[PDB]
């Protein structure tokens, strides 16, 4: 009883921000009751760390026989270096699923 159903990002596609706008990327992952989940992100920039943007707390929900694990990624202000491909990998030890998404930050006033 240690399996993962699917990992989805919200929003999933077509995220578009201006320079200096707050970026938000949640990462839901449905799993079984006994399953533990570990979130590791992958961002294109080299300015931020994994200790800033990724959530320190957790967000879990229980429903009948399915558990939800949620991890958020908050960036206070964005730049051209942040533009690229974001990926949220949710590893349980015995399994690891990942989903991709593209974000665009244009040079324009917010």
């Amino acid at each position, epitope marked *: 009883g240690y399996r993962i159903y699917d990992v989805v990002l919200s929003p999933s596609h077509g995220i578009e921000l201006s320079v200096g706008e707050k970026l938000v990327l949640n990462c839901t992952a449905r799993t079984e009751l006994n399953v533990g989940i570990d979130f590791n992100w*992958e961002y294109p920039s080299s300015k931020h760390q994994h200790k800033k943007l990724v959530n320190r707390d957790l967000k879990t929900q229980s429903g009948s026989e399915m558990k939800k694990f949620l991890s958020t990624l908050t960036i206070d202000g964005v730049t051209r270096s942040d533009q690229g491909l974001y990926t949220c*990998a949710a590893s349980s030890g015995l399994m690891t699923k990942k989903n991709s998404t593209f974000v665009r930050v244009h040079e324009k006033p917010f």
Partner: antibody, heavy 115, light 107 residues
Framework: VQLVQSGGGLVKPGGSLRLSCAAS????????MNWVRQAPGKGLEWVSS????????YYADSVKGRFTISRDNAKNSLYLQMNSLRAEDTAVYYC?????????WGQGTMVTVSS | IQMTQSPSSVSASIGDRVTITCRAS??????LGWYQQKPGKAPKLLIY???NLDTGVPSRFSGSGSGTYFTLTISSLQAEDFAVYFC?????????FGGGTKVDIKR
């Protein structure tokens, strides 16, 4: 995409040696890594697993309370310290990437525990 | 959770339709993997989640089945395909492997 192994060799019952597995070709930080062994002639046996940030660790009943799994994500390498070895631990040990199935396997390294 | 492969050995020639069976003790829905191992070197994933082929693997390999019964078919056997084949379950806590099925040269 590669997975090079090293560190294995000869040990006497009770002794211990480090077992390295260096990744290159993909983002190491992200996937869960497992250890699977194969005794000479015998089939495959899952030994241990570990999450991407070393949060969740699991061991088989054959290796629980003796083997210790670990990883350094900065170095992009997987480790496995093997303490209190028995004669039935002599096998070919494989590190492997996990994603649905064990899609990427290391070349393999044989450890020998005999007296 | 036990995985039993049938048969233990299969005699085949080049171009044959070889089928390998893998049976579980309890239901695994669709979480079955297939691996190929040749003597001396490490195993390589052929198929995952029962039917889905891995990248790089030729289309002659195919997988089917669900629950307890599963099957790995090779549509047209080639000289590279002579090797041992293991099935592996991903439902219960400990992922167990099958005993293995050797596909060797008919004689």
């Amino acid at each position: 995409v590669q997975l090079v192994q090293s560190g294995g060799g000869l040990v006497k019952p009770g002794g211990s040696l480090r077992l390295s597995c260096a990744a290159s070709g993909f983002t190491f930080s992200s996937y869960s890594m497992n250890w699977v062994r194969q005794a000479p002639g015998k089939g495959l046996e899952w030994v241990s697993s570990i999450s991407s940030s070393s949060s969740y660790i699991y061991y088989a009943d054959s290796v629980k309370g003796r083997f210790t799994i670990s990883r350094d994500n900065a170095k992009n390498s997987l480790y496995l310290q093997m303490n209190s070895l028995r004669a039935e631990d002599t096998a070919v040990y494989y590190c492997a990437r996990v994603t649905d199935a064990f899609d990427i396997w290391g070349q393999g390294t044989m450890v020998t525990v005999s007296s | 959770i036990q995985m039993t492969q049938s048969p233990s050995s299969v005699s085949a020639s080049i171009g044959d339709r070889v089928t390998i069976t893998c049976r579980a003790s309890q239901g695994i829905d669709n979480w079955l993997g297939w691996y190929q191992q040749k003597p001396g070197k490490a195993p390589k994933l052929l198929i995952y989640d029962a039917s889905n082929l891995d990248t790089g693997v030729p289309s002659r390999f195919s997988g089917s089945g669900s629950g307890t019964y599963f099957t790995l078919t090779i549509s047209s056997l080639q000289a590279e395909d002579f090797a041992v084949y293991f099935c592996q379950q991903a439902k219960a806590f400990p992922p167990t492997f099958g005993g293995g099925t050797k596909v060797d040269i008919k004689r």
